[PDB]
Design a protein around this ligand. Sequence first.
Ligand SMILES: O=CCc1ccccc1
Ligand SMILES: O=CCc1ccccc1
Ligand SMILES: [Cu+2]
Ligand SMILES: [Cu+2]
Ligand code: NA
Ligand code: NA
Ligand code: NA
Ligand code: NA
Lengths: 620, 620
Amino acid sequence: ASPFRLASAGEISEVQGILRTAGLLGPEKRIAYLGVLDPARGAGSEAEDRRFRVFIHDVSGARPQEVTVSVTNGTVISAVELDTAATGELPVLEEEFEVVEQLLATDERWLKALAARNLDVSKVRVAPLSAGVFEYAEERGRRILRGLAFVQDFPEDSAWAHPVDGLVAYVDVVSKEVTRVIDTGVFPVPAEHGNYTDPELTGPLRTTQKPISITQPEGPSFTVTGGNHIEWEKWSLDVGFDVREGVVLHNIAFRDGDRLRPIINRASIAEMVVPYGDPSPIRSWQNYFDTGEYLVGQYANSLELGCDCLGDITYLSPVISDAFGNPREIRNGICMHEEDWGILAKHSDLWSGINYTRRNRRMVISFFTTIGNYDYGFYWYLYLDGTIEFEAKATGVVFTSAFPEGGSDNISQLAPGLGAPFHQHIFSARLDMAIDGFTNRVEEEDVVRQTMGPGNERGNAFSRKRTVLTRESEAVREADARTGRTWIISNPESKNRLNEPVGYKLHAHNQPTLLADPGSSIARRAAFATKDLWVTRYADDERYPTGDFVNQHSGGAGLPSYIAQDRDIDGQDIVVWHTFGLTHFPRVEDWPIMPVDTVGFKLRPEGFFDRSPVLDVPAN
Amino acid sequence: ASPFRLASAGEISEVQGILRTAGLLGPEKRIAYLGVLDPARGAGSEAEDRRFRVFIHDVSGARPQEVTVSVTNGTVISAVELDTAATGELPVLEEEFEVVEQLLATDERWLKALAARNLDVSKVRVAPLSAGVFEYAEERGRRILRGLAFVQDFPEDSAWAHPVDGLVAYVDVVSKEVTRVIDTGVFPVPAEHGNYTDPELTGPLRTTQKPISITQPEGPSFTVTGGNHIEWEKWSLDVGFDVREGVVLHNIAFRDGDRLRPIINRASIAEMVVPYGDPSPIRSWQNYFDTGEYLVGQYANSLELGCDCLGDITYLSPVISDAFGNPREIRNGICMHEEDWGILAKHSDLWSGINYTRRNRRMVISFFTTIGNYDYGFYWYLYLDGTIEFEAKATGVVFTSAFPEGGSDNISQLAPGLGAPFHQHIFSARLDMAIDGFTNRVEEEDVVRQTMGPGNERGNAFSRKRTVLTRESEAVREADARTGRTWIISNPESKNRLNEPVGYKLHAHNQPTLLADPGSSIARRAAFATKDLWVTRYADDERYPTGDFVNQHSGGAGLPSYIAQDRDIDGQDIVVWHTFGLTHFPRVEDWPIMPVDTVGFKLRPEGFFDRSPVLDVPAN
Ligand SMILES: O=CCc1ccccc1
Ligand SMILES: O=CCc1ccccc1
Ligand SMILES: [Cu+2]
Ligand SMILES: [Cu+2]
Ligand code: NA
Ligand code: NA
Ligand code: NA
Ligand code: NA
C-alpha cells in the first residue's frame, strides 16, 4: 500500500508493455535508466499513482528520449526528444563495455600500436572510460568513449597489473568509428602479476584466526513490513533502491513518546566523481562519475552470508530493468542488521554510590557496488542516541599506469615499472531535510576565541557564533576545521522544553575538496565538489548536483544553476548537499588489492530532544 | 623474565619495606605516585634491575621527596627533597577528596553562605578541584584545593543536578585553613533531579532489544604469555599499566615474514586537560589535568563481563600502591579482545571472473577511568592491515552551573535554571617511535595544487610535498585540514623493495586546539595543547608534556623547555607528541548522563611493507 515500496517485477513488465505499445521500444532502443518517481509534495490525497522515469537510447543514431509513464493508469505521461549536444548524453550502457575493445581490435592504427609493443590483440583488455568534454570539436553531440589498454596474460590474470601506457583511443560507439588513436611512445608493460589469489604471491594462508560467532538467538530487534519499511529502536524509515543512486532512505523519523517526529525526508548519495591528477595526455581527461555516468545501483553485488554480511542478516533483493525492459532481480543486494556498538553511557558516582553502564548499538543498511576496477560499500547507520551516519568504504584495485623512469610528481610507484596516478574520490550527499516538519533553516556555527581583557580577565573564555543562511546565494559554504565549523539544521517553529528551536548538527570530516584548477573542465562539470556545503530550496526537478545527463555535458548544470534562483531558505522546505571525499596518494600497501579506506559524515541531535533519548535503554 | 612485566604485589611490598627501613615512610608520609621505570636505552646487557619511582608527600608540612628504589637490589638509588614553590606540588591524593568538604563544614564564612541559601550543610557535597596558578600570592608553595558545592537531596541523589552557583572557597589542605570564601551572589539552586535510574525520569524500560550473542567457540586468536605479552595476527607487544598514564603499550612490532619489525617503542596518553571557558570568577580558574594532577590509572574501573566488555574477554588485573605502600589490585581493570571489523578487501573483476572478499578484525585493549563527574574509556586498536588507532570515549556527567537569567555566551542550558559551561577535553599522545629501529625522521606532507598552464594544460594535475623536520625548534607544527596535512614517520636507513624509506603516516582528526588566550595561565601550563604536533629527541627524563609535577606549577615546564635544546631529530631516536581533543558545547541530550562522544588518531603504514600485508588472510 505504501507509495515508497520497492519497484516490483510486475511494475517493470508493465512499463515495458506501455513503452512497446506507444511505439517507443523498437529493436533499436535501449533503456539506459529506469526508476520510480517519488510522490509529489502534499501526497495527503491518498491518490496512488506509481510513475516511472525512463531514458531511452537509440543505437541507430536517432535522438534519445526522456519518458514518464504511469503504471497505475497504463499511460505515457510525457515523452521528450533530447538534443544531446545541448543537455548531455545518456548514461553508459553495460553493453557498451565490450564495444570499445571490439571496435579497436579491427582498427589499423590500434593494431599497429600493439604490434610495435609485441602485444597479442586477443590478450588486450580495453577499459571503457567516459569521455568528458575537452578540446575536440568533433565530439559535440556524439556519444564517445575513451579506451585505455591492459594486458591479460591468461583468462584469470589481473589485467590491472599490466597497463599499456603511452596509448589512448577515442571511439564513437553509435557510428562505430575510431575517431583518434594517440600513441605518445613505448613504455615497458609492467611484468609482475597482481594475482592476489595466487599462492606464490600470498604465501601459505594464516591458520591463526579463530572464528568469531555473532548470533541473535531471539532474532533481530527490527521489523520489516510492506517489503521495505523498517522499525527499529524508535526509528522508522523506508529503504528504497534506485539504479542510479543505489540505496535511498525515505521518511526517516524517530518515535519520541507518542509523536513520530520526522528528521530527514530523503537521504541519498546523489553523485560521486573520481578525478585524476596526472597531467599526461594519456590520462589528463580521466574523470568518471560512477553515479551519474555509469549508475552504481545496476552494478550492486549479491552479498554472501558470512563473508559480506556477518550476523543475523535480513536481505532485500531489489528489482531493476535491463536494457530491454525486462525485470532483473539483484538477489541479496541489500544487507540489513543490527550491530553492538560498545558503551553507550557510563558513570560511577563517588557521592551517590550508583554504578551505571549501558551498551550502544546501531542499525546497518548497506550495499556494495563494483564498476570496473573499483568497489565501494555504502553504509547507512542509525544509532540508539539519534545519530545518523553515512560511511563509504573504498576498496578494489587502484587504476594503474607505467611508472616513468626518473619518477613523477603525480604518480606513485607500486611495483617495478608500475605506477598509480593520484586521484580523489568525492561524494555528494543529498539530504532533503525535514527536522520536525518541512519548515527548516541552516545555521553555520563557528568557535569564537575571546581576547583577555575586561569581562575575560583570566583569558579563558571562549564562545560560539551562529549565522543563519537566508538565501541560496549565501548558502555555498566551505569547511573550517580550525574554527570547529559545523552546520545546524533547525526548525524555528518547533521548540524543545527550553524554548529553543529543535535541531540536528552536521559533523563533516573536513577532507580536501576538488583540487583541480578552477578553470578546468572538471571544475565546471563537478562544480558541486569545489565546496563543502550547499543549501537549496526544494524543487521536484532538482535531483542531482550535476544535473540529469552528466555524460559529456559541457558544464554548469545542477547546483550552480539551481542556486542562481536565489530562493528563500530561511524557514522553508530545504535540501542540504554535502561534499566529502578522499584524496588518494596510492601506497605500496594498496597493491595488488586495496585494503578498505573510509570517509563519511554524521548528524547528531542538537536540542532535538528534551533530554537524553536513551534513558529507557535496559541494563543488558 | 621480561623487564616490561606488570608490577607485582611482591614488588610493591618490597618497595614499602625499603622505604620504611630507610626512614622515608613514617606516619606523616603518603605515597602520591609509585610506578616502575622503563629500562634504559641499550638494555641488551640482560642486567635485570627493576626500579620504581616514588613521590612521597608529608601531611605535617615537611618537604615532599622524590625517591628511586631498586627492588632487585633492595636499595634506595636516590632521594631528593622538593621545593614545591619552584618545581610544583605533588598530585592530588584520593584521601584529600573528603578533606575539602570537611574543612568547609566548620568555617563560619562557608556556613553563613549556606545559611543564606537555606542549605543544610549535611547535604552539601564539595568537589575537590585543582587550583592552578593565578593572582593569589599567598598560594605559592602551599598545597591548595578549590571547592565548588553541589546539593544532594538524599544519599542516592545525583548532586550534579543541584550546583550552588555564586560561591567558591579555597583551602590549604596541609595547614587545614580555609584561605578565602568568595560569594558573588545568590543563584537559585536548580530543583529538577538528574537521577537517570529513577523510573519517573526513564519511563518504562524498552522491551524491544533482542540479545546480540558474540562468542568464540575455539577461543580467541591472541595469546598472552608472561602475564602481559600479546601476540595477535603478526602483532607483538607488551601491555603495561602505570598509575599516572593508565594503559601503556611497549614494543609494538609486526612479524613480516621472518623478521620482527619494530614500529613503536612506547605509546601512551601522557597528559590530558579539561579547560573551562566560563569567565565567571566562580569557575574561571577551572582547568583540571586528570592525568597529571589526579592520576587516571588509580581510578580505573573494574570492568564487568557482558556490560563493559562483550565477547570472549581476557582480563588483566594491574596492581598499584595505595597511599601507605600496600599493594592494591584493580580486578579486571583491563579488557582485551578481538572484534570483527567488517570488510577488509573486496573485488569482483569483470575480466578475470574472480570474486574475492576478506573480512577485517581488530584487537582491542581498553580501560575505563572515573574522576569525579567524568568517565573516560581509553581504547587502543590494532588492525590486520597494520593500522594502529587510539580512541577516547568521553561520557559521565557534564559539570554544571546555574543558568543565568537572560542567558550566557559561555554556558548552555540543560534544564530549567541548570547550565553547563563550555569546555574542551584535550589529550596528548606520547609516541616514542621505532619505525624499523630507532633511526627515524618526521616529514610534514601537504597537498599541492597546481595552476593550469604549460605542463598542466587541462588544469587537472595535483601533487604533494614533504618537508623534513630537522631540529626541535622547527618541529612544532599545526594542522591544516584544507591542505590534507599529515605527518610521516620514516626510517631513512631502511628501505622497501622500491628503494623508498619505510614509513607510517599519522592521520589527525584536525579538531581545534586550546582556545584560551595565549597570555592566560592555562596556555602557559598546558602549552602542549596549543599545537597539534611536537617532535623531540628522546631523553630518559622527558616523560610528560607538562613536566613531572603539574599541580600548581607556574608554567612552561615540559615540551616548551624540552624543544629549547634544539636537538637533531633528522634520523635520530625521536618522540612524537600529538595533541587532539574535543570542544564541548553541551547539548540538552548530554543531560542527565552523557552519551559517548569520541576523538582519537590513527597511524597507517606508508610504504612500510612491500605490498598489502593481508594477502595471506583466509576466506572465512
Ligand atoms: O568506474 C568507471 C570507470 C571504469 C569502468 C570500467 C572499467 C574500468 C573503469
Ligand atoms: O576530574 C577532576 C576534577 C574533579 C574531581 C573530583 C570531583 C569532581 C571533579
Ligand atoms: Cu583511490
Ligand atoms: Cu565535555
Ligand atoms: Na552544452
Ligand atoms: Na526539505
Ligand atoms: Na615556579
Ligand atoms: Na624513538
